[PDB]
């Protein structure tokens, strides 16, 4: 209904964007709210310079380091820039089969 009612807003204010467009805009806004909230969650981890936190993200949808085209790639921004190297080198609980594909 936020998408529908916002579409009503844009329709009556004269802006021409279809309802699915407003759905997409609302989805992106919510996903950015999710990114901010998860950034807050990870910020709970480290508060003092001596803090050591083992963050376990058990969601399957958190983008893998190798999956740069993953749908929720923006969630990779949750990890602070400084700790992105350990994000790249991170232990995967349930990874997805890779191979040695000769066409490398």
Partner 1 sequence: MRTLNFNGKISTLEPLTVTVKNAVSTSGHRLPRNGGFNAAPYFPGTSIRGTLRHAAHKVIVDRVGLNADGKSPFDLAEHFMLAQGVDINGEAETFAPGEINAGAELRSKNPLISLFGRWGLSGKVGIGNAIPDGDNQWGMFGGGARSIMFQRDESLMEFLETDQVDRLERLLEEQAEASVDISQIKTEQDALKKAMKSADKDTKAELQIKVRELDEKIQARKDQKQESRESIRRPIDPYEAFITGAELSHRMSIKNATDEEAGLFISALIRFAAEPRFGGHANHNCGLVEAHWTVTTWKPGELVPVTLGEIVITPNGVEITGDELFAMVKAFNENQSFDFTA
Partner 2 sequence: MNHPVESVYSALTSILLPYMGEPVPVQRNCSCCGRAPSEFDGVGFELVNAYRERVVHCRPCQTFFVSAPELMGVENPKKPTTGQKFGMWSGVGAVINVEDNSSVLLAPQGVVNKLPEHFFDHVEVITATSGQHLEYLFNTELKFPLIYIQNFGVKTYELVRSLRVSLSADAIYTCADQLLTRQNEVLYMLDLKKAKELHQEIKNYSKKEMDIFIRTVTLLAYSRITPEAASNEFKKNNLIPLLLLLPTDPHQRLSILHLLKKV
Partner 3 sequence: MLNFKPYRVIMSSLTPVVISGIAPSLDGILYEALSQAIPSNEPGVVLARLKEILLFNDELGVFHASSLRFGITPEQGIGATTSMRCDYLSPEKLSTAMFSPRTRRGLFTRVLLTGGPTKRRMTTRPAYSAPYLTFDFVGSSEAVEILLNHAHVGVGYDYFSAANGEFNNVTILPLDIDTSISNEGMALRPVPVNSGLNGIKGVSPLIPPYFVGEKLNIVHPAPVRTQLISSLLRG
Binding site for partner 3 (CB under 8 A): 65-66, 68-69, 73, 84-85, 88-89, 98-99, 101, 103-104
- Which region holds residue 80: left if phi is over 0, alpha if psi is between -120 and 50, else beta? beta
Which of DNA, partner 1, partner 2, none is residue 61 near (CB under 5 to 8 Å by kind)?
A: DNA
Binding residues for partner 1, rule CB under 8 A, total 12
18 or 66: whose CB is closer to DNA? 18
């Amino acid at each position: 209904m936020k998408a529908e009612s916002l579409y009503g807003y844009l329709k009556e204010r004269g802006y021409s964007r279809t309802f699915e467009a407003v759905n997409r805009n609302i989805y992106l806004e919510n996903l950015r709210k999710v990114i901010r909230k998860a950034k807050q969650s990870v910020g709970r981890g480290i508060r003092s310079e001596n803090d050591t936190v083992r963050i376990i993200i058990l969601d399957p949808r958190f983008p893998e380091p190798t999956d740069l085209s993953s749908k929720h790639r923006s969630l990779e921004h949750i990890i602070p820039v400084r700790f992105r190297r350990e994000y790249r080198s991170c232990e995967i609980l349930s990874p997805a089969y890779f191979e040695e594909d000769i066409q490398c």
